[PDB]
Amino acid sequence: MREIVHIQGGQCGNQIGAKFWEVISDEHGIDPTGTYHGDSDLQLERINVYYNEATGGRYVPRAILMDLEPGTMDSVRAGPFGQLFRPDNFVFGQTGAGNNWAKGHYTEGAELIDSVLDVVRKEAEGCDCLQGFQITHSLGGGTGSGMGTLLISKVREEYPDRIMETFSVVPSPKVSDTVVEPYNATLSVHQLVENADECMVIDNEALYDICFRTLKLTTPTYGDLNHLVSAAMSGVTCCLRFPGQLNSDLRKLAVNLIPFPRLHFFMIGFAPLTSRGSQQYRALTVPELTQQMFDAKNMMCAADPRHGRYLTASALFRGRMSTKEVDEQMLNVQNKNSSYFVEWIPNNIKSSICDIPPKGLKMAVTFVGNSTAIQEMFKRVAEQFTAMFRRKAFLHWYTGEGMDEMEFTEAESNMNDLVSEYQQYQDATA
Amino acid sequence: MREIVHIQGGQCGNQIGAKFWEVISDEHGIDPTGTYHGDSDLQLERINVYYNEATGGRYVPRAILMDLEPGTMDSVRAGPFGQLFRPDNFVFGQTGAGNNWAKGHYTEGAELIDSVLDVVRKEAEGCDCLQGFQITHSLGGGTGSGMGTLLISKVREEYPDRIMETFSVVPSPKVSDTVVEPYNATLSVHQLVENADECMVIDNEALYDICFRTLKLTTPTYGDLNHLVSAAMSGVTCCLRFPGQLNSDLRKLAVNLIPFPRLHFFMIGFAPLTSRGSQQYRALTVPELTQQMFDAKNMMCAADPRHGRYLTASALFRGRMSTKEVDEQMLNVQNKNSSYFVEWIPNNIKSSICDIPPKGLKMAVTFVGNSTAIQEMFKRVAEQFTAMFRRKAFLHWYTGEGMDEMEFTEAESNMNDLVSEYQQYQDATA
Amino acid sequence: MREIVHIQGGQCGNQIGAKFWEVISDEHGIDPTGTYHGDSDLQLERINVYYNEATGGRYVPRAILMDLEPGTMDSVRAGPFGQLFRPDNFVFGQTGAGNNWAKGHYTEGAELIDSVLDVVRKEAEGCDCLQGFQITHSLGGGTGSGMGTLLISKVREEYPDRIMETFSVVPSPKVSDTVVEPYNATLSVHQLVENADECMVIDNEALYDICFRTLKLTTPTYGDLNHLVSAAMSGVTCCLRFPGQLNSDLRKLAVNLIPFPRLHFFMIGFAPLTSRGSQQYRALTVPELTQQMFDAKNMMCAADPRHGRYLTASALFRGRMSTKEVDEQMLNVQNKNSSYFVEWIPNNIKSSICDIPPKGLKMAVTFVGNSTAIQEMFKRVAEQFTAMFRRKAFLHWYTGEGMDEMEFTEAESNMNDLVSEYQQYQDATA
Amino acid sequence: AEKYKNEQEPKDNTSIQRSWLPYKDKALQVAENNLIKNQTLNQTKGFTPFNPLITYKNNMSQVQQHDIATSLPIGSGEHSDQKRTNQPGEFRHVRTDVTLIRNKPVTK
Amino acid sequence: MREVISIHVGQGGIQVGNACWELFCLEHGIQPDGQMPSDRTIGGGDDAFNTFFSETGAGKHVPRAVFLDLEPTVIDEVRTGTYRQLFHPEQLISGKEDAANNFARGHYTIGKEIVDLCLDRIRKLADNCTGLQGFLVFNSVGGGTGSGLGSLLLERLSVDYGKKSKLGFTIYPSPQVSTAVVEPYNSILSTHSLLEHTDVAVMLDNEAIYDICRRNLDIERPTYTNLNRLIAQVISSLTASLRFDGALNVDITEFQTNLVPYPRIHFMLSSYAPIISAEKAYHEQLSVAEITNSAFEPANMMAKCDPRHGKYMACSMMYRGDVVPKDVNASIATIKTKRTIQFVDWCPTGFKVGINYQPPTVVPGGDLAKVMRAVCMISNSTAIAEVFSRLDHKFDLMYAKRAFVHWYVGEGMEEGEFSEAREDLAALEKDYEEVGIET
Amino acid sequence: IEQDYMYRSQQDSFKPRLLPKGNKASDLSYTYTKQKLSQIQQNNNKELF
């Protein structure tokens, strides 16, 4: 019944997926031991989208766990909800990636991808009717970036018509934790546009910014940042698992958000968000949810969406509500901000309603937008890349695995052309 | 429905606003926790004028608090009824103004005013039908007189048609707390005439004088003056919140009180004020109320009403009475004091009636008057200003922050023209 | 047709001229080698106003560069865009003037003015119908001011009907470069008042103020100052080269601005001028465009316009804007600030509109206003000069070169006469 | 804006001085009730902090510990619910059963 | 599963090995005899100590290290001290005659009968380890047997193993305060030896640590034990990420991947913070921003060098304790804002941040105060050319008059070796100069 | 300068050609849909042996 498998790699990918399965399990009322303890039957009707079936009535997720070192999967197994993961699904190497794109994409990635791909093939064919793939990985790391994009190339070759979703984390110059990030970031972005149907950029600079400003919590931790990402992940596929006034799956959103096949980079946000000391003073209504949704500071990306023009946008609503206000509120925001929407695509906003809100809430909104302001991320990354590349700094590591400068050269041109393409469509009038 | 938003700045403004919100909460029967505990249904029909609604049925005032130093807002938060105000509406700096107009209007005021302007815009767009603004600030202070008037200019530019009020505490020579009062007082008086639609001028000296004669209490305190001003403020807008025979909103006051565009400086008063000893020995009737109303010592300004002539006046009765008696008393007083009213305008007194007296009172009257006696209040301020500015005393603090003495020269000139054009009608005859 | 030729004098003139010709060439699309690189047909409709046709289709400017030292020509020729000029127009002395107005006017000028008059007559007769001459120089130096004032003096008697405008960089005492600035400045004004049809005063002090405050750039250089002058200089003849709603050539401005023949000194300013880190928001509409125009800070002269009354004003708008709002704003500023305008010219502001905006900008405007505020700059120079003339120092070198104290006395008296007859109109009433 | 002083002498009792109002002001009774409530709350916990005013600041806030369905239930933060001893060898690795292999398989 | 092997050659190497190994035993709770005394120890996967120690089959744990020296005094002192029962009897290789401050003796004449035993023991240690990360080398450059055996052993290991990482914590002579007289000769010769055969080299000059101890710990008469303890703390901070849980962890292949731009340039200097005594430990907040700010001060460098005279190329920073990523990010933002510290143009970002949860441990009888935060620095900078320049200046003064060279030539070494060493050191100095220029 | 004119004019005379036809993952999915839609007929008309 159009289920989707989960794939995650690297340290950043593993931690995001470690909390995503925690939120979903709470959403469907699955205890850490694997037993259903819900209240309503709607929680159990469409459980097959994520969970398989085992003896004794326990449910097991169809998640695949990959990394080139055993250190990370020791932590995910010891954490909460860690007994819900298949011991056979774990596939690990004993060497690591060393923050090197070449090492994780040519030498160890090639010699390990055979084992993980067999798990993917067995997991995918077991289901009656597949729906697509979703991947969580980081573009600043070694094994998340290198072998992670190698699997994407292999999967797209064997499963052509399926939908490929990627919750990607690119590095920002402000909060930097690696000197060699521009190399393995640009090389992955060139590969990402090759095959991925949908790309959803995430920045730690933006996620930190929300915690200091919006939630007003003094000491944020990676566990707090993972919760915001996991909340948005379940939102985009909310209506695929529950009834609603209007239905929308992953394929439907791709149709209404991709004017051209190469323009498949989205920026996402979630509402509502309020600090603990300010929750009692806020009234939750459809006007309030949509007011926070378009706010620039609410995005999970470092790009400012008011520096460019939206091409397409989408909004998914959770909980019971009236279709009259939902229709008119999207109408009002389009009329008041006609300068921020390009003029050759009238009615460039999508609405969807699911009647089951997230656990512990009454109304929730997930936003996915295609904007031409995302290009300033690739501009600043390529700005740092060319500064290092003109002096051939750190290049002896990459050349040591057979990769030549031609791959570096063609990564520059393809990245520049993608940036040049976004600007041209923003600079277009009827 | 024709609701108003409240803006307060500076220490004096914050104290007046806190006391006023206490009085309004008492009138509407709202406990410090924001839960309605009234007895009559009339207390909820128009609650939206001053209060919003949130989750759990608690009501939040739509008030905005701004300052440059966190000293006073930390006190109002910890004081009683301090939990009503929304924590997001507290905007403050960290440096303070130090009784310098430039520090609160050019450098520190400008950098901080963006956030408070955004909050004001959000609150104004949230409400259904905006009716106007009311401001409480002090003209003799640093952050108040400067930042409040900068915000006044900004909001008047942004909303051109909405009516606007100010309750300004202008310094007086008899009770002096600062040596640099004339400078920023003159500057703010210059900046107010072009933007403020209605000004309610107040002195601390007049309030002390009232407390020492009429109230006859040995040891008054700043709380008493605060509560008198709050009672007057609440009495201004009684008919817009409660039913009556002659409903009169804020625009009806301006039309009946402003003959010429630049004549909008009023002096207010309240009745009845009774000593503690003679509380039960005094009868409450319309003639007594109007006699105390037009007693010259009941005004909240140091200017003597008997040194000039009234242009127009307005009285706002509250409680149950007879329309004939009120009109007869107004006619009688206007006929017996014919020399005190300018002759070329007939019947220059307006009366309005509301059906709800204050809490624990039978009848109450709020009096607002436009009289030429305001010339003396500005005359004495300008007298100090020139005698101090001729020697250029304390002027390097102002000129050390981008301001030129040409601004002082122009500000002094505009005040003199205002006084002359205001007093020309005291001598002009038809 | 109705062509004007450019002649620049002194070190200051060549620096200003070097940037001005780079500015104009960019507007009309001429490369460093003199070949067209524009995109529209209108770039050649009136290209003959400043250029000549050369064999092969190349365009060359009508600039005559004169000086007493070759150190300026060999520096401006070797710079970029220096190949456009014809070498035959390069005329320079071999000895230098040494900041000596007498040397630049009596002993060394007399033998070299034979060459400049030959070339300037050739250029003047080459055009079909001459319109006027424009000159850039400074009154603080010797060669720029000395042979300068002499040059206008004689070319005037050959062309008593053609208009003559000059841009004057008058020195300021707060930021002074030469000890003998009062001497050569007073003499230059005497020879310039009775010869030039139009004169514009430029203060280098104000140029620092604009760059420091509005531009908010840390380190300005002489190049940036030259760019500020050229931008205002170019906009004066904007409608002379491009069509517009109300085109107004130089003669039109000359008639409308000077009420009397001896009052032809102007102050100029430019708008809009934004900071380097200008965020992408809104657009520069007329209400904010005209607000920055009349700001006293935006003026490029040390004379504060609020110290006197405006005799008249003129605005040169660039862009596609409606005439109605342009007209009514000028009525708005006149009514609001009637104190700064002389009452005996009703509607004393002239407006012009040009359809071609400056490159890379939506709407721009240039201000040329004649106000009684310039008497301060004359008064302050006279005080310095009379202090430096009683001492009889630095005079024997002026005296020991063909002249005596009679010229200085008549120059001071005439300059005093100018100020006296300039203040009478300020205090005159109708 | 005033020093709340209550004593037997009427000239400095505030309530005796501010009785000229047409009604009973809702600031003095609220303050007294707050003082009594803070005293009782301190007795429940036990603070005796040398004066009742020290704990009065944070005994009046209505901030609930948990969320009220207007934001994501992430709590007050991971760092809030963390305890720290400092014995040597406290944070050593555990090597759970998933990665603890023994026999090193030889064939493929 | 992951292991490292420590190699100690020379008296300085052994006297640093003593301190680092006592610190490791105290960190992992191993008593001096060799057995864990807790008696609550269990099996399963609690084998966090396998990085340094190894099960002995019955009881104790044997460290993965060897000691080399041609002079038996220090090794006999180790065999007599309280750590007698810990080390394996056979893995303490000792000679008969000292090298006597001569590079030729320890590299051509008497090192050949010890190098074979050393390789045999290293192989017998390496076959035991299954996840061998790499090697650590401790030696004193300004000493005969130290430099000679270090050179020969590095050359042999480069061909015996190859791709395994090699890290060297060597001790160059101080610019003006030194003990020996002929240390420039063997210093430059060992510089050539380690230029093309090591992966990462760390500067460990002595008067720098002397000044650090005098300024911070208020000790007017420091000795070698304090220096060894500080170096042991540095080593533990560097290696902590292998065996303790942390938010952001690094490895040996993590360090050199993000720290050396070119194969030739791998010389770098270290720093530590905070260094404080018990008396001053009370009255300081010891915030992360404060300790990171103190870490970049020129007076805290472990080598007598001033980074203000050159540009940086990379910075690897390791935190341990209870630090947080947002605070460390703010600290790096402030450091980047500061103008006194400047980087090279072709390195826009230059910070690698590792965070470890384990707070530093304290040795009873030590000097460092017991703290809950610490930061270690491994910075590669262009300003390191000064130390090579000063050694070159000293060498020429004696080589012009050919002092002491008869002893070097009577042991079989040809005269041209000095010329080759000088040429190659000059070539190295030029490379460091051309790297730091702008494009 | 005249050959500069000619070269620049002829190189400028070529500008407006966009034809958006980016197809890397879309084309791979496209050629699969066409194959399965067309090769079923070729499968079902095959002659038995």
Ligand SMILES: Nc1nc2c(ncn2[C@@H]2O[C@H](COP(=O)(O)OP(=O)(O)OP(=O)(O)O)[C@@H](O)[C@H]2O)c(=O)[nH]1
């Ligand atoms: N920092 C530090 N340096 C030491 C220590 N012990 C010896 N050294 C250094 O070693 C140098 C002298 O060489 P030694 O270590 O005594 O002997 P060697 O290096 O083994 O060479 P031989 O003299 O032939 O035995 C001195 O200059 C010291 O710098 C120590 O405990 N700490």
Ligand SMILES: Nc1nc2c(ncn2[C@@H]2O[C@H](COP(=O)(O)OP(=O)(O)O)[C@@H](O)[C@H]2O)c(=O)[nH]1
């Ligand atoms: N948002 C988020 N970012 C993370 C998390 N864990 C690590 N990162 C980021 O990932 C980067 C390091 O990635 P890395 O672990 O080297 O990727 P890998 O080598 O492919 O496993 C760091 O800069 C972190 O900012 C997480 O749980 N959430």
Ligand SMILES: Nc1nc2c(ncn2[C@@H]2O[C@H](COP(=O)(O)OP(=O)(O)O)[C@@H](O)[C@H]2O)c(=O)[nH]1
């Ligand atoms: N009625 C009343 N007036 C006050 C109060 N507090 C201060 N003032 C007056 O405000 C003046 C000082 O203004 P200030 O608060 O310093 O202005 P600011 O610095 O801009 O906030 C004094 O002259 C007081 O008379 C108060 O609680 N009630």
Ligand SMILES: Nc1nc2c(ncn2[C@@H]2O[C@H](COP(=O)(O)OP(=O)(O)O)[C@@H](O)[C@H]2O)c(=O)[nH]1
């Ligand atoms: N705006 C501007 N002013 C200049 C420039 N060069 C010199 N000046 C001013 O001109 C004055 C000196 O003029 P000077 O060079 O002696 O003129 P000259 O005698 O013709 O060479 C100084 O006070 C400077 O402020 C320039 O490039 N731009």
Ligand SMILES: [Mg+2]
């Ligand atoms: Mg020895």
